[PDB]
């Protein structure tokens, strides 16, 4: 507040974009009940994927 008469009302903009990105981030990764799931390329090693 450089001066009292100025009444420097701040504009919270960084917080806004941070939340706008974080919501989508969590909706991408943490949306599913699970996190990840390994996948193999052959049947000889599929028993270990699950």
């Amino acid at each position: 507040p450089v001066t009292a008469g100025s009444s420097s009302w701040v504009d919270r903009t960084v917080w806004e974009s941070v939340n706008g990105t974080l919501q989508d981030i969590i909706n991408v990764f943490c949306s599913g009940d699970e996190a990840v799931t390994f996948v193999a390329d052959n049947q000889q090693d599929s028993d270990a994927a699950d």
């Binding site: 009302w9 701040v10 919270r12 917080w15 806004e16 939340n19 706008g20 974080l22 919501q23 989508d24 969590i26 909706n27 943490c30 949306s31």
Partner: protein, 145 residues
Amino acid sequence: KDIQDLRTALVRGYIDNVNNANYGRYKALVGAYDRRSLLDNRPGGVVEMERQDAIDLFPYHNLPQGIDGLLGMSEELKETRTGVTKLGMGINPDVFKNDNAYATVGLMMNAAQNRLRMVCRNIAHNGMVELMRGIYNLIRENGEV
């Protein structure tokens, strides 16, 4: 918090302006009082004597032309900064589990809706789930039912 205060101030301004304009004070000269006629407030019989221009309405200040812009800015800021909206459609558990549950028309891809879904997901993952896990570890470690 600030927003609230801000709005109040603006509102206050508006209010006081009206709170003065409703008084409707009249400016006048000296040789045109005619108290008997002036105080008498009836539709007909007034005496605006002494050149017919000795009386006029008090020139009150006009309303700030930019106030409505600030009101709209504050409103849209409250709307987008949080998950609130005047006519926003309420969320449901089905969409919280899968936003595309109503992908036909309820895409739900609104800034406020997602800002709200994020906080609800935070509450769920840091709240209810921990409570249930604790209750399970508790009932599983005491008592015979």
